[PDB]
Each structure stands twice: as structure tokens, then as C-alpha cells.
Amino acid sequence: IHFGNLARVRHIITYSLSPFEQRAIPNIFSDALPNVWRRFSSQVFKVAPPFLGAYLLYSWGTQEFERLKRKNPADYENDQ
Amino acid sequence: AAKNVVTQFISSLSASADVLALSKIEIKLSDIPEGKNVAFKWRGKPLFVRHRTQAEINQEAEVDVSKLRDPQHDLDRVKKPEWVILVGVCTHLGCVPIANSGDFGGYYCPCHGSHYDASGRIRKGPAPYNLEVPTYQFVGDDLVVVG
């Protein structure tokens, strides 16, 4: 039993419609998408930064590692 | 979705492909001489496929047994005449009868007697039933497919 002892609430009215009177996915273009963008925008600069900083590190270390496999022609010049 | 996944899993429990591979055995009748009996391994136990001569559908098909132990009346479940297919396992204590001797020309289980005539039927001995006769056919006459 957790429904009824939860909180002390006063003077709040709420209105709702049966699901059969409304649209399941309404205002896709006028509301949905705009917010999807809103949300994306506000986070990109917090998330993306470190992931990008990792891509770099990854990319560098992967190459720097391959570079150390190639040879340095300056070890076979005094070989005549 | 549910019906298929459940089907798939339930199937997992039935015989695997390797086990099924030993399910049936196809024997070549065109390599078994008269009278002489041959035993082939089928599902771990012996399988007897004898080529009944002329004096077997006669000297062993006239058995005047009234209340024959195991009620085996040929017309019930048997086919080819010069062909008798059996499961070489004594119904007494699962011993493999020998088609060699047999007090009745048929088979003899050297475990406790049990003499089976040349028709796969218990005669003199302890074994209650007659050496079981399996499923098969001659889709290709020179071939019999047991199992």
C-alpha cells in the first residue's frame, strides 16, 4: 500500500482526455522535432567534447604505433 | 514469434542429426543365401534377416501349436515368405539368441534355454514373448529398409 500515504497536496487541478479522443503522436513537425533539436543542441557541447578528445588520442596512438613499425632509412646509410 | 522460438527450443531436445543417422538401416536381400541367417547391428542391438529356404515355410510354418505362448499368427504382422526380419534380443533377459543351432531349427538363447523356431517365436524355454519384429519395407525389393 503506497497509494494514499504519499504526499500532502492542495489546490491542484489536472485535465486529461481519453486516449481514444487524442492523437498518439501529434504535432510531429510543429512541436516534436523542434524539441528534439532543442534537446540535442543543449547537450552536444557537454557530451561530444570528451568523445572527440578520445577519438583523437585513439587516432594518434594507433598511427604513432604503426609509424614505429616502418623503418628509418638512416640506419642503413653507412652500410656500403 | 513465440510459436517459432518455442518450437525451435523444444526441437533442441529431440534426436540430433547424428542419432537420426543411425535410425534406419537398409539391407541388401540380394546377398543373403537360402536358409543361412545374417545378423546386422541396428540401434545397438542385433537385427536378424534370414532367407527362409523351402523347408522353413513348410517345416516351420506348419507349427501345430494351439495356445502358442506369444500369440504370433503370421498373417497378423509379417510379409515376404523367404524373408523373416527379427530383433535379435531374447524377450526373457535381453540376451542375443543364436541362429546357429536352435532346438527348433530357429534360434537358441544360450542364457536360459529359450528356443525360438525359425519364425522368431518362443518355443521351449523361459522367455515370455517372441523375438520382436521391427518396422521396414521393400520399396526397392533387392533392399529392405528397417527403422
Binding site: 503506497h2 497509494f3 504519499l6 504526499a7 497536496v9 557537454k46 557530451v47 567534447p49 570528451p50 568523445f51 578528445g53 578520445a54 588520442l57 585513439y58 594518434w60 596512438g61 604513432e64 604505433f65 614505429l68 | 525451435q8 527450443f9 526441437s11 533442441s12 531436445l13 529431440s14 540430433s16 542429426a17 547424428d18 542419432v19
Partner: protein, 380 residues
């Protein structure tokens, strides 16, 4: 008596008071869908495991082939095998997000629910560990050998515990048969403890993205979250199955299609993706014992998070500084993961030691610090 037999019945009252009339916050996001997925996943692993166990043979001379026989001969044995191995992955992907969510939204403040969560993680890790040995391929044997050999670095009680655990002088048949038993067992303990997990949770009820009392707006778990969770299931399940059925061997090591051989050490011994980050931290500290301790702490550190919370707010929803630090940490983990799959050579070795160092730093120093700093920026 009670009017509806859903409130009175000692059993239907249970199904009801935890899945039908259970009060849930009206605003929990999709990051709250992982608990159910973890559960469903668990029931799934157990089912496919039993199906496989019914055709397995715990013996060094038959293990590798019994599994091959299962895939090759058992009706849909290949499919059941695929789902089980890949299910273990799904299981971990789900569990890591489950944890992440909890760290971000301060769910760990529900200490008992959180501490049992950690125990579930460890049990799951040991479970996958022993399960991995069963097919008895090269990686199965060397993974078992290398890892269980670390215990001999413990003082005194070490060299013993190891030969006790192995049942001999090296990973051999006796080790295999006891691993099958443990693998068959642990999952049930997981189910057990999962019950305890949900019991503690239900004391308080779910937390929610804003971290403020949801008492003013609770909703019945059904149909809201039953439908939301079922949808969340199908959403995840599509990639799981897609990867499973179209790229079966994407995640697996090919060295495991070769029967274990004690006289041939594989060139690169590395775990499944979900253990890589820990492998990296293990190898970061050269010194058998110190590396073991560092590995141990990499996971046991989770028991400390509840105590390093300094913020006056529960979640990170309204704490921009903590948010980036959080994503730094996540990215810190991809790096350790990557490092874990790379050989022990420059530049990897140093990148590795850094990532490890940063990992513990972020959790033990920065997080508690930034929280304090943030309270002052709110004038608190």
C-alpha cells in the same frame, strides 16, 4: 477479506504490489528501462544455458567437441549457442548502462539497493568468467590460466588458494568440471540476490531524472511502464539479434576455434570486450600484486561512490560541471577498453597508465571536489 483477489492472495498480492499497482515516478526516462531488461536477460541466459547444458560434457577430452556437436548436430543448437554467448554481451551492455544511469542520477543514495547492485555485478563477472572456460578453446584455457594465476601473488595464502582452486598443479580437467558446476550455480544466486535488490528498492521507490520527490505525481507501473519496458525490450533486441544472426563471430576471438593446448601460448591473450577496461587497469601496474589490487579496486571502488557525494542536489541534471566530468569518465572508459585490446608496447603502455590514473582520480578526487565547488556557486 479483500474485494479484489489481487490485494488479498498471498501470491497475486506480490505480483500486484511490484508490477501492477506499484507507484512509479511519472517521469522516469528510458534509462530506467535497463532494470527490467537485465531481469529478462537473466531469465533468458538461464533458459538457453539449460538447453546447452543438456548436450555438454564437462571433460577436457570432450568439451570442445561436445559444443561443436551441439552446433552441428542439435536441432537449432547453433542458434541456442549464438543467443547464449551474445546474450552474455547484451547482459553486460545493459548492466553498464544500468550502472551509468545510477551514477549520473545519484541512485546510489539508495545504499542497500546500490550495494546489492555491486554484488550482482561481481557475481555476473565471475559467472561469465567460468562460463567462458567451458568450450575449452585456446582463449578459454589461457584466460583461465593467466587470470587464476594472479592469486599466487597474494601473500602466503596465495600459492595455496590457487592449487586449491585448480584442484591440481595447472588448469586441467578437475578445474573444468568444477567450473561447469559453478557456472550452472551462480546464475541462480544472481536471481536470488536480484530479488533482494528489488526488495530494498521497493522500500524507497524509484528515483527520477530531476532528483526531487515524485510523491506529488506517481503512476501505476501498469500500463505505463509495462508498455514502456516492453518497447524498450524490442528496441534493444533488434540490434542484439541483428548482430547475432548477421555477424555471429563479430565479438568472438578466433583463437577459440582451436582446441586448448598447454604447449602453445597465444600471441595475444585478451578477454571479451566487457572485461577489457579492467584488463587495461590490470596491466597498467607492472608488479603482479599491485596489478591485482588495482584490478580489484577498479570494481570494488563502486562500493565507495555513495560516500563521495558532496552535492546538495541528487542528480547531475542541474550540475553542468559534474556532467562534463561524467562524460570525461565515460570516454575515459572507452580508452581503457581500447587499451585493453592493444599489445603491451609504447605508446599503449603509457596511454594505459594515464587512463587508469585518471579513472581513480576522477572518482576519488575530482567528483567530490567539483560537487563542493558547485554548492558554493549556488551560494550554499
Amino acid at each position: 477479506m479483500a474485494p479484489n483477489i489481487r490485494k488479498s492472495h498471498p501470491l497475486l498480492k506480490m505480483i500486484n504490489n511490484s508490477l501492477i499497482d506499484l507507484p512509479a515516478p511519472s517521469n522516469i526516462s528510458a534509462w530506467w528501462n535497463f532494470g527490467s531488461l537485465l531481469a529478462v536477460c537473466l531469465m533468458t541466459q538461464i533458459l538457453t544455458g539449460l538447453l546447452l547444458a543438456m548436450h555438454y560434457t564437462a571433460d577436457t577430452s570432450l568439451a570442445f567437441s561436445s559444443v561443436a556437436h551441439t552446433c552441428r548436430n542439435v536441432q537449432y543448437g547453433w542458434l541456442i549457442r549464438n543467443l547464449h554467448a551474445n546474450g552474455a554481451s547484451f547482459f553486460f551492455i545493459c548492466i553498464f548502462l544500468h550502472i551509468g544511469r545510477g551514477l549520473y542520477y545519484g541512485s546510489y543514495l539508495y545504499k542497500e539497493t546500490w550495494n546489492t547492485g555491486v554484488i550482482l555485478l561481481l557475481t555476473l563477472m565471475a559467472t561469465a568468467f567460468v562460463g567462458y572456460v567451458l568450450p575449452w578453446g585456446q582463449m578459454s584455457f589461457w584466460g583461465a590460466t593467466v587470470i587464476t594465476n594472479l592469486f599466487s601473488a597474494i601473500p602466503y595464502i596465495g600459492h595455496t588458494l590457487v592449487e586449491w582452486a585448480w584442484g591440481g598443479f595447472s588448469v586441467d580437467n578437475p578445474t573444468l568440471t568444477r567450473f561447469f558446476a559453478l557456472h550452472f550455480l551462480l546464475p541462480f544466486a544472481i536471481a536470488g540476490i536480484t530479488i533482494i535488490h528489488l526488495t530494498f528498492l521497493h522500500e524507497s521507490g524509484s528515483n527520477n531524472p530531476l532528483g526531487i520527490s515524485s510523491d506529488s505525481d506517481k503512476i501505476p507501473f501498469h500500463p505505463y511502464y509495462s508498455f514502456k519496458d516492453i518497447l524498450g525490450l524490442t528496441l534493444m533486441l533488434t540490434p542484439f539479434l541483428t548482430l547475432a544472426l548477421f555477424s555471429p563471430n563479430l565479438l568472438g576471438d578466433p583463437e577459440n576455434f582451436t582446441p586448448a593446448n598447454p604447449l602453445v601460448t597465444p600471441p595475444h591473450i585478451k578477454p571479451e570486450w566487457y572485461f577489457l577496461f579492467a584488463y587495461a587497469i590490470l596491466r597498467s601496474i607492472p608488479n603482479k600484486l599491485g596489478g591485482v589490487l588495482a584490478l580489484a579496486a577498479s570494481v570494488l571502488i563502486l562500493f565507495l561512490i555513495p560516500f563521495l557525494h558532496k552535492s546538495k542536489q541528487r542528480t547531475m541534471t542541474f550540475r553542468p560541471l559534474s556532467q562534463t566530468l561524467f562524460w570525461l569518465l565515460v570516454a575515459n572508459l572507452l580508452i581503457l577498453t581500447w587499451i585493453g585490446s592493444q599489445p603491451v608496447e609504447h605508446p599503449f603502455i603509457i596511454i594505459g597508465q594515464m587512463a587508469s590514473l585518471s579513472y581513480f582520480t576522477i572518482l576519488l578526487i575530482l567528483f567530490p571536489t567539483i560537487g563542493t565547488l558547485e554548492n558554493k556557486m549556488l551560494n550554499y
